[PDB]
From a paper:
JAK2 protein contains seven homology domains (JH1-7), of which JH1 (residues 836-1132) is the kinase domain, and JH2 (residues 543-824) is the pseudokinase domain. The JH2 domain has no catalytic activity but could negatively regulate the activity of JH1 and inhibit the kinase activity of JAK2. The V617F mutation site is located above the N-terminus of the JH2 domain, and when the valine at position 617 is replaced by phenylalanine with a higher molecular weight, the prolongation of helix C and the interaction between F617 and the helix C phenylalanines 594 and 595 of JH2 domain is stable and activates the JH1 domain.
Here, we report that Flonoltinib Maleate (FM), a selective JAK2/FLT3 inhibitor, shows high selectivity for JAK2 over the JAK family. We obtained the crystal structure of the complex of JAK2 JH2 and FM. Two nitrogen atoms of pyrimidine-2-amine in FM were found to form two hydrogen bonds with the carbonyl and NH backbone of V629 in the hinge region of JAK2. The hydrophobic interaction between FM and the surrounding amino acid residues of JAK2 could also be found in the complex of JAK2 JH2 and FM. The L551, I559, L579, and L680 of JAK2 could further enhance the binding stability between FM and JAK2 JH2. The benzene of FM could form a hydrophobic interaction with the side chain of L551. The I559 of JAK2 also interacted with the pyrazole ring of FM with hydrophobic interaction. In addition, the other hydrophobic residues near the active binding site also contributed to the binding affinity, such as the V610, F628, and F631 for JAK2. However, FM is different from previous JAK2 inhibitors because of its unique ability to selectively bind to the JH2 domain of JAK2, exerting its function through an allosteric mechanism.
Numbering used by the authors: 536 to 810
Write the structure that this text describes.
């Protein structure tokens, strides 16, 4: 279960944005660490909105499944603060924030090798999940966090972690699901409870498209009704200008769930690009 953290030991600081029915804040946790040394630890405080408290179970189950595993590419959960009025997840703070914002800001400093490294790390995380037969259900660049920037003078590649899925698509309003096209696969638009390992393979492809597109959002110009018809007409996303992963993207975003490649196969395909 989750380590229960006291309101008294948490300081809330600046807002870092929003998720679905959530707000995130940078914060500080007072704790006793190794050797009994006192620390003031930077943390991410994720707060379920007051007006959506009926989603509290899905909110914590999302973080819970994530926290019964340990892996270098998965965001750490420190605990929960059930205390009082609010429902709060206390997670590790990641310096450089979401990948989608980072891509947009640094679009012109990010080359093919950077993208390949991040894609490989994300595939490793998803491979780990697949081996444990655990569904994430919300893979997207917004839910990928950058721990460390690239350093091309000390050899260091960038390093990412995948954050928790948030409130499951199985219990979310239809309108939110439709807006999440094309991350949510077609079979889940027809029936959200078609949530399957195959689900994350589709969303992985959509996330690769993001990575290759400098933080653009695919189909952003389409409203929810046009997004629905995009799936009905069985369209594929356009290749990004940097089209090196275009085939991989389309192979993952296969309208037939059973034909989507394993993350083993995906990683093998990723390792094949270079010279
Ligand atoms: C789990 C987690 C851990 N650490 C962090 N850290 C973290 C650091 C920095 C930012 N910035 C926000 C503002 C940016 N600019 C300057 C103004 C407007 O864009 C600058 C970057 C950040 F959003 C997040 N976030 C998370 C986490 C958990 N869920 N989510 C989703 C809901 C987004 C993120």
């Amino acid at each position: 279960v989750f380590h229960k953290i006291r309101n008294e030991d948490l300081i809330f600081n600046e807002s870092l944005g929003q998720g679905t029915f959530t707000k995130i804040f940078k914060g500080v946790r007072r704790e006793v660490g190794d050797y009994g040394q006192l620390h003031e630890t930077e943390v991410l405080l994720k707060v379920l909105d007051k007006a959506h408290r009926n989603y509290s179970e899905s909110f914590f189950e999302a973080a819970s499944m994530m926290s019964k595993l340990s892996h270098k590419h998965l965001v750490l959960n420190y605990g929960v603060c059930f205390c009082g009025d609010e429902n709060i997840l206390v997670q590790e703070f990641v310096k450089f924030g979401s990948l989608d914002t980072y891509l947009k800001k640094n679009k012109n400093c990010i080359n093919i090798l950077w993208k390949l490294e991040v894609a490989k790390q994300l595939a490793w995380a998803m491979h780990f999940l697949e081996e444990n037969t655990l569904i994430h259900g919300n893979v997207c660049a917004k839910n990928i966090l950058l721990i460390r920037e690239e350093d091309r003078k000390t050899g260091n590649p960038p390093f990412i972690k995948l954050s928790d899925p948030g409130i499951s698509i199985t219990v979310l309003p239809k309108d939110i699901l439709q807006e999440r096209i094309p991350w949510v696969p077609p079979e889940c638009i027809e029936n959200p409870k078609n949530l399957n390992l195959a689900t994350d393979k589709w969303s992985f492809g959509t996330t690769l498209w993001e990575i290759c597109s400098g933080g653009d959002k695919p189909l952003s110009a389409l409203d929810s009704q046009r997004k629905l018809q995009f799936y009905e007409d069985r369209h594929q996303l356009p290749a990004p200008k940097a089209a090196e992963l275009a085939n991989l993207i389309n192979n993952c975003m296969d309208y037939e769930p059973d034909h989507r490649p394993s993350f083993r196969a995906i990683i093998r395909d990723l390792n094949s690009l270079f010279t």
